[PDB]
Amino acid sequence: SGWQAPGPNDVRAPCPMLNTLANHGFLPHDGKGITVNKTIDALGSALNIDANLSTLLFGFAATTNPQPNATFFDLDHLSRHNILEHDASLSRQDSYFGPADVFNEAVFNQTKSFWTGDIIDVQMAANARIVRLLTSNLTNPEYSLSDLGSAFSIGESAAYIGILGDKKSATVPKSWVEYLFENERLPYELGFKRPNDPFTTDDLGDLSTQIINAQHFPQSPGKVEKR
């Protein structure tokens, strides 16, 4: 009860959380036909994301629909390279090597190695993201990161801390984040509980600023801080 894997006619995204929400049925389980009201209600119901943040993210998602000025998207629209989907993902390979939508064990093993305690803090999250950016630049001859992609990358690391964990301490249990990525299921049994306070655009911006502030390069090696 409450969760079912995708089947052969269902579509999924490069987003661990939207995939999780579709697997649970907060979003349509086939991944298709997601509108702004469905996004607001699903992310509100599951996670207590604010309507305004849900609407902002919906607006970006709709730009990935190949139909112009669309009022919906399908989860696989989000996989289109270099719209929202970007290189140096934490758990997906770069498009150049292989499909950038599905979980990739080799890539996630790299990320996990920078989560060095039982509790992930901002420093660990920033560290992991950094190593992915530099690794992709040095191994992918087609590596790119647009301004929007950089903003998305920073906000994805802010999101797993603040939405799955405690936005005020800016920490999250490592096991919870691992579980989300590796199962695309919410880690209720490990202790996750939907927060009582809504998660807002300003919350995401505050954690994104914290991520950037935890980066200590002597000199920035490419696009590491663009919002």
Helices (H) and strands (E) in the chain, counts: 8, 2
3 state SS of 31: coil
Q: Which x/- pattern, by CB under 6 A, does the window 99-118 give for ligand NAG?
A: ------xx--x---------
Least separation, in Å, of the C-beta of 23 and ligand NAG?
A: 23
What is the torsional sign of CA 119, 122, 125, 131?
negative
Report if residue 92 touches Mg ion, rule: CB under 5 A.
yes
Rounded to whole angstroms, the Cα distance separating 158 from 209 reads 9
74 binds, among Mg ion, ligand NAG, ligand HEM, none (CB under 5 to 8 A by kind): none
Size of site (CB under 6 A) for ligand NAG:
10
Q: Is-contact 31 12, C-beta < 8 A?
A: yes
Q: Is-contact 165 120, C-beta < 8 A?
A: yes
Reading the block at residue 21, the tokens are 């929400």
Least separation, in Å, of the C-beta of 220 and ligand HEM?
A: 20
Report if residue 98 touches ligand NAG, rule: CB under 6 A.
no
Q: Tell me the residue nearest to Mg ion as measured from the CB.
A: 89
* Residue of the chain from 22, 34, 122, 145 that contacts ligand NAG (CB under 6 A): 145
Reading the block at residue 89, the tokens are 């993902």
From residue 217, alpha-carbon distances to 126, 180, 211 in Å are 12, 30, 13
Question: What stretch of H or E contains 119?
Answer: strand 119-121
Report if residue 14 touches ligand HEM, rule: CB under 6 A.
yes
Rounded to whole angstroms, the Cα distance separating 40 from 49 reads 8
**49 has which bridge partners?**
199
96 binds, among ligand NAG, Mg ion, ligand HEM, none (CB under 5 to 8 A by kind): none
Binding residues for heme b: 15, 86, 89-91
Q: Which x/- pattern, by CB under 6 A, does the window 75-114 give for ligand HEM?
A: ---x-----xxx--xxxx----------------------
Query: How far is CA 100 from its chain centroid?
Result: 13
Report if residue 214 touches ligand HEM, rule: CB under 6 A.
no
Q: Is-contact 90 70, C-beta < 8 A?
A: no
Least separation, in Å, of the C-beta of 223 and ligand NAG?
A: 4
Report if residue 17 touches ligand HEM, rule: CB under 6 A.
yes
Least separation, in Å, of the C-beta of 141 and ligand HEM?
A: 18
**56 has which bridge partners?**
none
Contact residues toward Mg ion (CB under 5 A) are 85-86, 89, 92, 100
Contact residues toward ligand HEM (CB under 6 A) are 14-18, 39, 43, 47, 49, 57-58, 60-61, 78, 84-86, 89-92, 152, 156, 159-160, 163-164
